[PDB]
Amino acid sequence: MKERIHEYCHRLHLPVMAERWSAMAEYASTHNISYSEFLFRLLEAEIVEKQARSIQTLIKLSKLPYRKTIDTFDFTAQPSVDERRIRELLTLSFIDRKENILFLGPPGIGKTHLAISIGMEAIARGYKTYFITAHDLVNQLRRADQEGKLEKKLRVFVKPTVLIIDEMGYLKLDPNSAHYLFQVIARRYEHAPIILTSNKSFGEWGEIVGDSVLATAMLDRLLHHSIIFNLKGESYRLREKRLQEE
DNA sequence: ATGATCCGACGTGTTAGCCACGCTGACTAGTTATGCCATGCCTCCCTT
DNA sequence: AAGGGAGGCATGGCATAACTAGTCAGCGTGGCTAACACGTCGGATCAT
Ligand SMILES: Nc1ncnc2c1ncn2[C@@H]1O[C@H](COP(=O)(O)OP(=O)(O)OP(=O)(O)O)[C@@H](O)[C@H]1O
Ligand SMILES: [Mg+2]
C-alpha cells in the first residue's frame, strides 16, 4: 500500500511530499495529531517548497547577473541617498502607483545593487520581474524585428511587472534602433514600473539615442510617474580597492 | 487459319446558304454580405 | 520535451438590407448543315 501511496504522490506532481512521507507518518504516529491539521501541515510544507522553487525559476528566467538585496547595502558609505526613500520603495507602492524608479550618479555608487535589490524584493512578493541592460534590450529588439517577430519580443519586454534597465548611457545606442527602446517606454507607460539605472544626466539622453526629439519624448513618458534619486559619493569598487591595499 | 489483294462504301474537305445561338439591356426576385452575439476550438505559455 | 491549463480569436447562427444574378426580348454574327467531289480506310474474298 505504501508503494501505491508513493506512486500516487509522484503522479500528482508531489515529489517532496513523497520524499517526506515516511517522516510525516512517523511524526503523526508518535504524536497524536488530527488528520485535518496533519494535512494542513503537509500542504503548507509543499506550498513553501513550491514557492521557493518558483522564486528560483523566476530568478533564472529574469537575467539577473548577481543576486543582492537591501540588507547588504551600506547606507553609511553612501550618505547621498536617504534610506527612508529606499525603504519606501521596498514597499512596492510604486507598482500600484505605476511609478518608475531612476538611479543616477557616478559609476560604482550602488545604482545597480539597489536596482537588483528592488527587483529581488518584487520577485519575492510574487511580482513578475525581468532584468536587462539597455544595449542588450535594444540589440534583442532589433534582431527580433529583423526576423519579423518584433511583437513577440515586445510582449516579452512588456509582460514583466517590473522591468530593470541597467547601464543606460555607458554605450551609445544605434540611432536606427533607439526607437525600439522608446516602444517599451511607450507600452509600459502607465502600465508597469521601470527601474532604470544610468550615469548620464537627462539632458544628455539625446546624445545616447542620437535623436533629441525621441529622447525628449522618452524622458517625458518615463518621468511622468517616477521617483528620481541623484546618488553621489566615491566609487564603492575603488573603496574596496583601497581597503584591500590598506 | 492467316495474309494479301481488290472492290465498295463511307468520311472528309470545300463552298454556299440559312437558321440558331450568343450577347446586350432592362426588370424583377432571390441570394449573399454584413453586423452582432454566443460558443467552441485553436494556440500559446507554464510546469514537470 | 511533452502535457495540461488558460486565454484569445475565429467561426457559426440569425436578422436585415442591398447588390447581383437570372430571365426575357431583340438584334447581330458565327457556326452548322447540305451538296458535291475525291481519297482513304474497311471489309470481303481468294490463295498458301
Ligand atoms: N553601498 C554598497 N554596499 C554594498 N555593496 C555595494 C555598495 N555600493 C556598491 N556595492 C557593490 O559594488 C559593486 C558595484 O556597485 P554597483 O554595480 O551596484 O554600482 P553602479 O553605480 O550601478 O555601477 P556602474 O555604473 O559602474 O555599473 C557591486 O558589487 C555592488 O554590489
Ligand atoms: Mg552599476
Q: Which nucleotide's C1' is closest to A14 (Cα)?
A: B48
Show the cell assigned to A33: 495529531
Q: Which nucleotide's C1' is closest to A57 (Cα)?
A: B47
Distance of CA A49 to the CA centre of its chain: 21
Compute, in angstroms, the gap from residue A108 CA to the centroid of ligand 2.
5
Specified resolution (Å): 3.2
Q: Are A103 and A114 in contact (CB under 8 A)?
A: yes
Query: Who contacts A99 (Cβ-Cβ below 8 Å, separation ≥6)?
Result: A93, A193, A225, A226, A227
Q: Cβ atoms within 10 A of the Cβ of A50, count?
A: 13
User: How far is A30 from A86, CA to CA, in rounded Å?
Assistant: 49
- Classify the C-alpha dihedral A56-A71-A47-A164 as positive or negative: negative
Cell numbers 525628449 correspond to: A216
Smallest CA separation from ligand 1 atom 6, residue = A110
